Point group: C3
């Protein structure tokens, strides 16, 4: 009954010459996300939500973004926590994300050793507003529930 | 003891020539949303907690089953789907971010609409109001955002 | 087993001539956050998440941007928030949060922020978390026009 919640945020710029990788899925696109890692904004947001729920700090303190997510899960477990569920949203004007959501969920559940029914990924546009609306970047946000 | 959490986001442009409807409430104002940003966010948080995908998967602008549906009917159908999936709703919290108009006078009405649609006691539904301190498109009154969190249990 | 969750958001402009106070920490810097109170964006977001979890409205309902709160210490506001949440019958189980800022560097101050929040909520450190982010050079955040914070809280009645 010792439940905890975590919340995470990430954003990266969309630039020429990078592959677009979100939720571990390589999505055909003219630009990709800019970062030191592969810049997987969704996995990063979920990673931060998991560190937050476990009160283990953040991705900046601790560190392929799937390997990092798998290591995050290891650290959460090390602290005595079990992951109960993850929910998330990706915000991008383009490209279309719906065809790729199922693969992302499958990847996240594998990396977190969760059944598919405890993992969720939602897709949003930003209604043409802000840097998101202009296609300058992609945001992700996440929530995680854990228990010790 | 099988609890789950969900989170939701929505945003729309604020322009003259549309009514302003938030949380099922029509608010007198010179501009409107181009589109109930609060109900959408809550709807998405509930689907998320149940791991049922999102509002786009359930209620396609394509689908004829829901053409013209009010954001409240969609919220009600969301809740029915959440229950059949085996989940009971424990609470909802949310924030509306808008530079104008003032939203405090309307909060109890929004809470009442949401609690009704989700068949929840009023004290398990919360709506919070923020400005964006004149920063960004929110700050310029070009759009309004909402965010939501939901706790459920199977 | 009567758990509830809350979520919070805040933002303030970054301006010359103001103290920069985040998570109760006074951070040396040429600019500070603008607000009616001390404009502690992180404590405000956490305060809203707590009121939200307890279904008690928001920081605007409880602490109106009244001369009673000009210059107000946002740690005193957070403690009063916690007092009201407890009066409503709720116990706090944990808090998580994120600060998004182009500058200054926040990592050196995070542990102090966590300690302040934990003291104010009468929680052990291992139930309080503060994460620091940049906005990867995007938007008004990327231009340093303001600082955002967001929070999540779990409580139980
Ligand atoms: Zn990232
Ligand atoms: Zn919407
Ligand atoms: Zn504030």
């Amino acid at each position: 009954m010792d439940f905890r919640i975590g919340e995470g945020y990430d954003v990266h710029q969309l630039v020429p010459g990078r592959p677009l990788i979100i939720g571990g899925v390589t999505i055909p696109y003219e630009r990709g996300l800019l970062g030191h890692s592969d810049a997987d904004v969704l996995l990063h947001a979920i990673t931060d939500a998991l560190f937050g729920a476990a009160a283990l700090g953040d991705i900046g303190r601790h560190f392929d973004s799937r390997a990092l997510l798998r290591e995050c899960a290891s650290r959460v477990a090390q602290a005595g926590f079990a992951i109960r569920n993850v929910d998330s949203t990706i915000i991008a004007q383009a490209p279309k994300l719906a065809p790729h959501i199922d693969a992302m969920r499958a990847n996240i559940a594998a990396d977190l050793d969760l059944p598919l029914d405890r993992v969720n990924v939602k897709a949003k546009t930003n209604e043409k507003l802000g840097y998101l609306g202009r296609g300058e970047g992609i945001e992700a946000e996440a929530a995680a529930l854990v228990v010790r």
